[model samples]
Target chain A: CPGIVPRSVWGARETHCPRMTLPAKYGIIIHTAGRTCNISDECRLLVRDIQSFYIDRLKSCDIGYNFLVGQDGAIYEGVGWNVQGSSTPGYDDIALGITFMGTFTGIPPNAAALEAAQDLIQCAMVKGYLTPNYLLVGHSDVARTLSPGQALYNIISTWPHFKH
Target chain B: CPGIVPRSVWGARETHCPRMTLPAKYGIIIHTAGRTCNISDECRLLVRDIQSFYIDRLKSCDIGYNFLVGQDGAIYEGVGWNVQGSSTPGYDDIALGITFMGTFTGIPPNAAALEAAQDLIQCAMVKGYLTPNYLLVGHSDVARTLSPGQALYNIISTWPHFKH
Candidate 1:
């Protein structure tokens, strides 16, 4: 498994959500729609801020994504693999929500971020958290909003297992 | 409140345990009985390794403590404030389990770790997660262990609200 930053390192609040059934069959991609971070320190702060925003402003139980990829090539844990995520409405319970830590509407993620994300998916599958043939989709594919963004979604659409 | 490292920063495994009732009535202290770390990077790895040890060797649901204090003066999130911890069997459900990240049998923790721990207790009370009048005790108080160790336990014994 890739080195994933745990919630403790980022100072996450205590959360109590239900566990998701393992080997999730769906893999949903998303973009933060916020500022991007390139260095580890910056990305760590950004992730923590996002968690606070989700809980304090959005009134969510915790950070929405299961995992987040930073431009620094680091993967930051959100709710992580076991807990059900709040990233997507209907798919939260059945999918692994992986979000890039920046707005990707105009441009795609850096190579490091992209590679880390794909590696995370592969790790999930190997660890039996995601199915071998998990269906990958951009957030916008299932939701009404434009998420994962145009540039990034274009890239994921070409990845294997991504469906229309 | 003190700056606390989230579980995500340390790469924690996803856990889904029951939430501890708010304003916990007791506070329990412990020692990891392992190697010590004095730098941020080193401390981060040590905390992660400890988590893996708890999950892999002890077969625990997650890291046993609610929080951990490193010699670097940083506080790490474990199960965190909301989740019930497995640090102490009888007190798990009613106390905030805060553990120092290394053995303290003969020597006390450094100033930074000590201050951070006290600050954490204050923060917990201010945040209303711990009762203002909560009883503080070493692991040996309610269990048959020399945890928190002799030296560290002596220090905490001088803190407010400590019971014999």
Candidate 2:
């Protein structure tokens, strides 16, 4: 969101989705290993790896996120905005989950990857998959994991781009 | 933040201060531009050029920001952290801001410059002047100008790595 990749990657601040078809409006941002990332192959490999995680987590389909952003700045469509994901524990009903492609635990997420995350959020808004009260939450907001990590979480919490 | 340079620069996550002071929490994150930066003193020229903008922005005593980062991952103490800076708005409220010695706006932000940013962020975190909450926001976050430009902003927003 800060550096200079592309708007499509982090500038997801464009505001795309409005409301989810499920009549819910929870906005969640989740962080993954990103450990699986390969700077040599930022776009493809990283995304596929996360996609597989979703498939395993949901055990019903491919990826669970409404959308995914790779550290390479590529935005991938996880599942349609109309469907629900297996991201949050109880908030699956009306929440649109976005999984960023990177590891934010000890290492920093890729610059392109961060924008990719924001882009996914804005894209979700355009699709009407999220509501106005959409809270930009870290995966740890309701789960017991170092999902988005402290650095990324802090960035989102204080995001000057979009706020209440 | 996806340009490639990084969103919050380096160690910005753990660096903070309601106001500048002490060990200064501020050190410079300068960039030499390349493995061959300023071999002829050209790179330092670039830094001074940026310094001029910063000095003008402050309109008071001198360029703010705590320090500068060189492409060699070498850190330099510039204006001093406790001194305050014009690179970022509300930046003085927390800690000094660091700038890359190169132009992260047009290019890939290079390897050494990025490494310097990483080390800068890393060191700053250890110092406690740069907290995750006190992030590496860009000029766009507050003003209508593009001081660091798009590339830098992209890197910041999506550069990724957060915390332990």
Candidate 3:
């Protein structure tokens, strides 16, 4: 299993949100329309900043994503497993939302980040948080916004479980 | 001349610090003891966060440093050219304080950051903000802290105008 940085390490605030049913059938990918980070230290701050924006500014329960990936190949626990993410409204309860840190409109995440995402998906299935036959799709696949950006979307579209 | 990211670009709050004498006699280097940033986007947020801490928490007039450098080879304007920095209390009024945004105890800043520091010093001389023969020294030289950490100190100690 890939190492995941917990909420405590990233200085995340306490959250009170609904839990999702285990073995979710869908996996959703997202992008934070923010700056890219290439190291664990840098990524941790970015994650914390995003959480602050969500909780303090947007008045949300917590950071919206289930998990976040950084260019450093590190995974940050956001809502974590079984938590209903606030990423996608309609699919929040049925999907695992994983957001890649930084704006991906111009370029895709590096190889390490891509590998970390795939590993996390495999981890979710092994741990029974996602179903073996779970469908993977970008945020744009189900929403109107240009999340997970065109550059990243092009790469993920080739993954085995990605749906049109 | 290297480009400097202005305080306005990084969302710095208004400061009411004392001004410094132009063409200062010393150039002091310091380290933030925080995480490293390798890109402008990441560094910008880091700079802003540090400024917030200095202004809101520490009750300081502004970020302690006169200027900050990132591993991205970017220079961030802090107290700027004529403002007296709060970095080293005794020398703040007589020196141009420059801090590298990261804990440098384990490793020196990358090549790009080092070059940026040198470039900024040259620019300061050219613009009449620093004396043509200013004495360059690390924060530890005059202060009681291990600032501008050992690794960075080792490198800067070899620079042209560095004083013991």
Candidate 4:
């Protein structure tokens, strides 16, 4: 298990589920929005689009990711704080989702966006939302889709929080 | 002057000096000896000791990347790929040290390890070392250090990459 840090100063957001207990001991899913999310309305559209993707497109019936981190580090209530997300197949039931708000497939991936994502993770760990044993994984970790992309995916490394 | 992408696919351990002939548009610094890297002798020592560091000390001081990419996809090199490395500022004068290793700070920065640390700046636009355009900043970009931290020194909101 990873150790949790206490931090009150933050510009980003996290889940507010009083009962928002993380299901799995070690699973953080990393996903790329697969497109440019730099637009002003990108957040709202993204939430809707993603919901449609899983519901209308994949027809999984449920949404993916428990909570979605926006481009600017804004945390969205995906399946809600405590609820499970529809991200990875079996792992979705256990993993928490974090998406870097842009399509990194062929692009170099933005640094600001990634910074926000990292902050989100840090916030989660500090708030006791994530554990040290918790492993950070790309969307491709569960299924095969360049979900996160190569350029942006390369930087993340050792973090202070976590049970380990 | 040089092509950003190596002509051929240079996977792990396959040494190929991609033409850095083109002036570097951005910079990066990171740790080495990630899982994919044989890590050799050089990397073993550099990243050997730090707060919760992961890489084994290198013997040769050759294997660690001025920039390194891990299996997960993060890219790291000495600090500021295109500029002088902050890791060892003394030597940073002639060369901008890039690290593929990692920051043993608090929480380890994940995948961003390999992500090209550049904004909308074009690599082709740069003519030489240490262009005045690249500003200094904070962790808001990436990492635990208040480094790439908060005030983006010059505070330019450049796109992820304008260069192809």
What's the lDDT for all of these models? 0.84, 0.51, 0.84, 0.41
- For candidate 1, give the docking quality class from DockQ: incorrect
Candidate 1 lDDT tens digits, B1-164: 67889998988889798788888999899999888899988998998999889889998888899999999988999899889999888789999999998999999887678767866775576466877567878999998988978989766764545665
Q: Report the lDDT of model 4 for residue A101.
A: 51
The regions of model 4 sitting more than 4 angstroms off are A1-23, A157-164, B1-164
Kindly report the fnat of each predicted structure, to 2 decimals. Answer: 0.00, 0.22, 0.00, 0.06
* Model 1 Cα interface RMS deviation (Å): 22.8
State which candidate has the highest DockQ.
Answer: 2
Candidate 3's residue-wise lDDT over A1-164, tens digit each? 56899999989888779888888888999999889899989999999999999989998888999999999989999899868889787899899999999999888887678767866775576466777557889999998889999998866674535674
Give stretches of model 1 more than 4 Å off.
A1-164
lDDT of each residue in A40-86, candidate 2, tens digit only: 35555555555555555644454556666555555555554666666
Q: Runs in model 3 with CA error above 4 Å?
A: B1-164
Q: How far is A164's C-alpha from truth in model 3 (Å)? A: 2.3
TM-score of each: 0.50, 0.43, 0.50, 0.45
**TM-score for chain A in each prediction:** 0.96, 0.70, 0.96, 0.70
lDDT of 4 at B135: 28
Q: Return the lDDT, model 4, position A105.
A: 59
**Each model's backbone clash number:** 21, 92, 0, 89
Question: Candidate 4's error at B94, in angstroms?
Answer: 31
